[model samples]
Target chain A: ENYFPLWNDLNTAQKKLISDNLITQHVKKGTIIHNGNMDCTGLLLVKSGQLRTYILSDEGREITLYRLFDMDMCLLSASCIMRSIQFEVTIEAEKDTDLWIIPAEIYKGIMKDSAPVANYTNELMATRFSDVMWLIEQIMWKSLDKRVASFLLEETSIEGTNELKITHETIANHLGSHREVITRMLRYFQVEGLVKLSRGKITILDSKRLETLQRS
Target chain B: ENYFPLWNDLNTAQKKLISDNLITQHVKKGTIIHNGNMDCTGLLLVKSGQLRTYILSDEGREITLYRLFDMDMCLLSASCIMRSIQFEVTIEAEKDTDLWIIPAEIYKGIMKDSAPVANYTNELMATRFSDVMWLIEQIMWKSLDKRVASFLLEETSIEGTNELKITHETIANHLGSHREVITRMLRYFQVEGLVKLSRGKITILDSKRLETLQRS
Candidate 1:
C-alpha cells in the first residue's frame, strides 16, 4: 500500500492501474541491482535503506554519480527505457533495502495516460541532471585538495557523524582519484590538525578548519 | 510555420496550440539570451545559426555545457518550467541566429495534453544530461593534455576544416581553464609539430600525430 507522495494525486482509476503493475522486493546490502550498460532495470522506487549509483572507468576505477535514499526514485537504472541516455550506470544497494520496481513499459504507459506523472518524471530527470552538471563543474574547476576537503565534510553531513568509518581506497574510488593521492591529502590534513586518521576511520578534529577549506 | 522533428508526431490540435504560442526572434551574434539564475527563458528552438550554452564560475572562468545548432531545442533555458534545476546557465547566440521561443506556460499546457511532446522533452533532457556526464568523466579521468588534443580534433571535425580560427583565450574559456595554461599547451603542441599556430589561427600540420595523442 506504500506509494510515493506524487501518487496520492492520481485518481482512483489511475491509482489502480499503477498499483496493479507495481512489484516490490527486499534486497540485501551490496546487491548489484543493475550491472554494466544497456540493462533495462526498470524504475526503482526506494521504500527504505540506501543505494549507490556509480560509473566505472575502463581501468576499473569507480566514481559515484549520486546516492538514492528512502522515497527516492531511480530513472537512470531504466536506461533501456530511455534510449537517449547512452552511458553506463551501475546501481548497487548500500544497505539492506526495500524497493518497488515499476516495469519500464508499465511506467511509460502510465506516463502516456497521466499528465501529472509525466511532469513529475521530467522534473525528477532535470533534478538529477542538475546534480551531474554540478559534479562536472566541481571536477573541472575545483582543485583536488579542496575537493577532498569538501567531500569529507559532505560525507560527515550525510552519515550524521563526525567519525567516518571509511578507508582511503573507498574515498579514492568515490572521488575518482588514486589512493596514494587521497592518503597524502589526509596526511596533510592530519598535520594541519583538521582531522585524525586512524587504521580505517577518519575523525574530524577541526570541523571549522574543514568547513573553511571547503568554502575557500 | 517552422517546426521541430518532434513536432511532426503531434496531432493537429496539439500542433496548432504550440504554433500559436511560439514567438520567433532574430538574435545577433554575441547576444546574451539568458542571464543569471532562476529566470525562465522559455524553450528556444534554433531555426538557424548556432547557440552556446555555458556556465560561468565565481572566478569568471567559463565552460561550455553544449551547443545548439539549426533545428535544435534548448530545454534548460525554460527554468521556470523545470523549477527543480538549480544552476545559473547563461546562453548566448554564437552566430546571428533565428530562434522560436515557446512560452513555459503554453508548453506545459501542451505537454499535459500531448504524450509525444512530453516524451520527446524528457528524451532531450536525458540526452543533454548524458553529455554532461561524459564531460565529467573526461575531466575526472583524462589528463589535460589528452583533453586538449581531443578537443582540437573534435573542433576540426565539427568545423570541417584543418585550420581553426580560435585563440588560446577562447580555448581556455571553453575548457574552464586559464589562458596561460592553454597557451603553454599550444606552444608544446607547436614544438611537437602537431600544429602550426599563427596569430589567432591554428592549422593542423600533423593531424595523425594529434589523433595519436588523443588516443593515448
Candidate 2:
C-alpha cells in the first residue's frame, strides 16, 4: 500500500476510501506531469523520486519555484479546488518519479465536507504564498556573490559536511546563472581559500569564510 | 449598512448573522491595524479609505506589498483562519479608514459548517497567492525603467488620462528607490518627452513613447 499524505489524518473508513480512490503511477525522467494553466489535475503526492516545479518565464527563461521530493504533497495543480489563476508553473519529473494522484472533483467534494482536508489545503496554499514572498526578497535584495555563497553553504547548513558533492553546472541552473559565471565565481572561491573544487565535487576548506561571505 | 464583500454571496439568514456580529470602527491615518506576525486578528473588510500593507525588511528597509482600498477584504491578519506563517506584513491605515472586523472565533466557526464561507475564503487566499507570485516576477525580472514606465502607463491603462495625478515622492516610496534618483529619472523622462512634471503632478505628454518603453 502506498503512503498517501493527504489521507494521513483521515480515519479508518475515510482513509480506506481515499486509498481506494488514488491513482498511482511511475513516470520516467524528463516526463512532464503538468504544464501551463492546467485542467484541474488535482492533488499530487510524491511517493518517491523527484519532481521539479518550474515556470517557462515570459522572456523564455525557466524559473524554479520549488521542488517536490519524496513524501512531498502538492496542491498547485488542483486549479478547481484553489479557484485561482494558474501560475503557468510546469511540473516535470526530474527523476523517475512514483506519485499518487487524487482527482480534483473527488477532493473538492471532501474539501467541502471534510474539515481536515479543507484546512490542510488552505494551510498548504498559504505557506506556498509566503515561500514565494520570501523568494522575492532573496532575488530583489541579495547579491549574486552572496547568493552563490549561500548556495554553496546550503548543503553544509543542512548538515555538517566538509565535502559538498555538487557540480558547478548544477549550481548554474539552480541559480539561473550561466555556467561560465558560476565556474568563474567558484574559481574565485577557490582562490579565496573558501573551497577546493574537483569535477562535480567541492571541498569546503574554509567554512568561516564562506559563512561570512553568505551574509549581506 | 456597509458593503461587506465577504457577505456578498450569503443569504439573508447568514447575511443578517454576519452584519449583526461584525464590529465596525474608524481608524485614523497611520493607525496600525496589525504588526509583525500577529494574534488571530480575524477577517477585515474595508468600508472606505485606504490601507497600506508593508513589510519591514531584514535590513531595515520598508517594502510595500499591496494597498487595500475602498470595499476591499484582507485575510492576511487573520492568522488563525489560514493557519500559515505570517510574513510580518504590517497593515496600516493610509487614510482615515472605516472598516468592519469579524472575530476569528466567529468566522472559524462558520467556516467549519458553511461551505460558501469556506470556499470564499479559499478563493480569496488563492487569488492573493497568484498576485504575490506576479509581484515576485516584477521585482525579480523587470528593470527599473520598465517598472516606472509600466507604472506611468497603469494610470492611463486604467483610463485614458493624459495627466497622472502622482508625484515623484509617491513613486520613490512605491519603488523603494531614493527620492533623488526618482527626481533625476523624472527629469530624464521629461528630457525624453515621455512626461512633463510640475510640483506633485505629472502630465503624460507621450504615453505612446512610455508604453513602447515599458516592454522588454
Candidate 3:
C-alpha cells in the first residue's frame, strides 16, 4: 500500500495481485541485498529507509550508482530478469530498510495476462532508460559544477523536497568527484546564495537560479 | 534471412507469424529513420549496412549513443509501445541500409509466445543496459584520452574488423568530445604505431597496445 503512490494507475485487483506476490522483509543497516555475482530472481522495491547500489572500479574503489530511498525502484536486479545475467553490482542497505521482493516469474505472469501491468512495466523501463541516458549525457556534456547542481535538483525532485539531507561525501560519491572538489562547489553555491549549508544538510534558497546552473 | 540470426529458436509457424507481420524497407544514407520527438510503433532491426543513433545537446551538438550495424537491433521504436513519448534521439542510416520494422503488438506477441525471441530481446536489452552504464562510468571515472581510446576499441570490436573506416568527426560525434581532442588523441596513437591514420580512415595496427593506452 505504501508503494502505491507511484503506481496508482493500477486497479484494485491489479494492485492486490502485485501485493500478494510481494514478500516484505527488513534488513539491518549494511546488509547486502544482492551481490555482484548472484543470479537475481526478482526486483527489489524500497519501502522505507535507504539503499546504495555500487560497483567496484578496477582500482577496487566503489563507484556509487545511486542511493535509493522510500518508494524508489532500483533496476539493477530487474535487469537480471531481463538478461538472465547475474547482477553485477552490490546493493547494500544504507540504513535499516524494509523492501518488497517480487519474483520475476510473477512479474512475467502479470505481463503475460495483464495489459495494464505490462504497460506499467514497459513505461518503468523507459523511464529508467531515460534516467540512465540523462546521467550519461550529464557526465559527457556537463562540467563538474553543473553535474553537482543537477544532482542536487534530481535528488530534491525525487524525494519531493527542496531541502536535501545529505553530506559532501555523499555528493562526491554520486558524482564520482573528489570530496574536496564537492566542498569547493558547495561553498560556491553558498556564496551565491543559491543554497544554504548546515550540518549534513543543504537547503535550496534559489530554485530558479539553481535551475539555471543546469546549463552551466 | 540475414536477420534471422537470433530467430531460429522459434518454431517455423511462429517465425512465419512474425515475418508476416514485420515490414521491411530500404533507407538511403543520411536519411533520418526516426527523429527526436517522433512516436515509435515497434522494434527496428537493421538487416544490412550501418545506422547511428544520437541525441542533440543543448549546445546543438550531436552525441552518439551507439552505431547499429548488420544484424543489430534497435529498441527506440519498440520501447515506446509502453508509453508514447517523443524519440529521445535520432536514428539515421550511416549508409544505404535495409531494415526490418516489427510493429509493437506483433513484437510483444512474439516475445510472449516465443521463449527464444524473449530471451534474445532480454539479452540484447541487458547488454545495452551494461553498455550505457559502462559509458557513464567511463565519462565520470576515466580521463578523456582513455575514453577516446576505449571508444576506438569498441568500434573495432563491434565492426568485427581489425581496422576502422571512420572519420575523426564521426568519433567526436559519438563520444560527445571535441573534434580537436579526438584528433589530438589519434595523432598520439599514430605516433605510438597503435593506429595507422589516413585521410578519413584509421586502421588499428595493434589492439593490444591500444588497450594498454586505455589503462594508461
Candidate 4:
C-alpha cells in the first residue's frame, strides 16, 4: 500500500478523510518543491526517491537541515500548518521522486479532530528540532576536517556507496562551508590516501581511516 | 488570573483536566529542575522568576539553549512527553521561581484528546526550534567578536540595564565560548570605549558603537 504507516493507526472515518484529501504526484530531479518562507506548501510524504531541505544565507551559502527519503514525512515545509514560527527553508527534490501531499487545510482539519495524528506530528517536529540541535553542536564545537570526514561517512552510509558522484560544491553546500574549504579538505584527504577525487566524484580508499578521523 | 494564557484557548474539560493534574511548586535560585536526559520531568509553566535551559559539553562548557520567564511554558523539559527525540538539556532556576508542572502522562493524554492543545504544543516546539536554528546560523556565519557584541546588547535589552551584573565567565557560558575569549573581547570593547568592565559588572559606555559592531 502506498499509504503512510500512520494511516493504519487512524479510525475508518479518519482514513477516509485522508484518502479523500491526499494528492499523489511525481516530481523530477532538480525540482524545487518549496521555495523558502511562504505559506504552507502542504505536508509531503515520500513514497519513493529523496528530498532535501536546507537554508540559504544572504550570501547564497546553503546548509542542509535534513533529508527525506522513502516513507519519510516532512512537516516544516507546511509552514502555515504550524503558526507559531516562521522560517525560510528550501525543499528540493534530490532525485526523481513520487510523493503524497496532504493540503495544509485538510491536514489541519484532521489534526483538530484526531489526537493520534496531532501527537504524531508533534513527535516528528520534536525529532527534527533535535536533529538541528545536533547540527548546531557539531558546527560550534567540531573542527572542519573532522566534520568533513563525518559528512563523507554519513553520505556513504546514506547512499550505500563508497563512490560518491557528488561535487565539492555540493559537499560544501551540505556542510554550510565554502567550496574552497571543501576542496582544500578533500585535497588533504587525497594526500592522506583516504579518498580519491575525480571530476564530480569521490571514491573512498580508506573507510577505516575516514571513520577514525571522524571519531577524532 | 495567574493562569497560562494558552489555558483559555482550551475547552472547559481540558482546563479542568489541567487543574486536576498540574502541581505548583516553589523553586530556589540555582535549583536544577531537569537533569539533562533521563526521562520526562513534566512540562514547566513559569509563574514568576526565571529559568535557563542549556547544554553542557564534555569539557564543561555550556551554551544556553533558551530561557523562560514569567508566564512562559517549557515543553522540551518534559522529555518523556516527546519520545521521538532524545537530548540532554539541563534546566536550572535562574532566580527564585514559582512554576506549575503538568505530569507527562496527563499532558500526553490531554494532547491525545484535544487538537487545540496538541497544535499549541507543536507551535511552541516549532518556535523553540526556530530559536535554535537562528543560533546555529549565528555560530556558523558570525564572527566571535560580533557574536559577543550581539550577546551583550541582547543581555542589556533583556535586563533593561546599561550596567549589567554579569561576569565574563557567565557571558562565556551563555555564548558557548571560553572565558578567556570573552575576557579578551571585553578588554577590546573597553579599549574601543564601547564598554567599561569592572569586578563582576560591565557598563555600557557607547551603545551606538556596540550596536554598529553587532550589525557589522
Which candidate's lDDT is highest? Answer: 4
DockQ of each: 0.71, 0.55, 0.35, 0.76
Candidate 1 local lDDT, A1-216, one digit each (tens) = 454767786788877866888888999998999985746768899999899889888898888888889989998877777778877788999889999988888777778767778778888898788777777777767888888899999889888999999889888988889999999999999999999989879998888888888777
Q: Residue A16 lDDT in model 4? A: 84
Over B111-185, each residue of candidate 2 has an lDDT whose tens digit, in order, gives 766666777777877776776667656765777777788778875654367777766766766666667888888
For model 4, the superposed segments whose C-alpha errors exceed 4 Å read A1-3, B11-13
Task: Residues A1-216, candidate 3: write the lDDT tens digits.
Answer: 667544576567667777888888898987988776564646778888888877666665455666778887765665545643323777888789988887777666655555455545545555666666766666667888787778889888866898999888778777777788899999999999989999878998888888888866
Q: Enumerate clash totals for all models, in the order shown.
A: 0, 0, 1, 1
Residue pairs with backbone overlap in model 4: B40-B80
**Per-model B-chain TM-score:** 0.93, 0.79, 0.74, 0.93
Per-residue error for A160 in candidate 4, Å, reads 2.5
Worst ten-residue run, lDDT, model 3 chain A?
A78-87
Q: Score candidate 3 by DockQ.
A: 0.35
lDDT of 1 by residue, B1-216 (tens): 555887678788877877887888999999999885636768998988888889998888998888889888888778777777877788999779999998888887788777678888888888888878777777767887888898899889878998999889888888888999998999899999988999779998888888888888
Query: What are the root-mean-square deviations of the candidates from the true structure over C-alphas?
Result: 1.8, 3.3, 4.3, 1.8
For candidate 2, lDDT tens digit of each residue in A1-216? 445555567777767766678888898988988876655677788888888776655655555677777887777767656556535677888779888888878788777767667766777777777667666666657777888888778766543687877677667656666678888998998998888989768888887887788775
Top candidate on DockQ is 4
Candidate 1 local accuracy as lDDT? 0.84
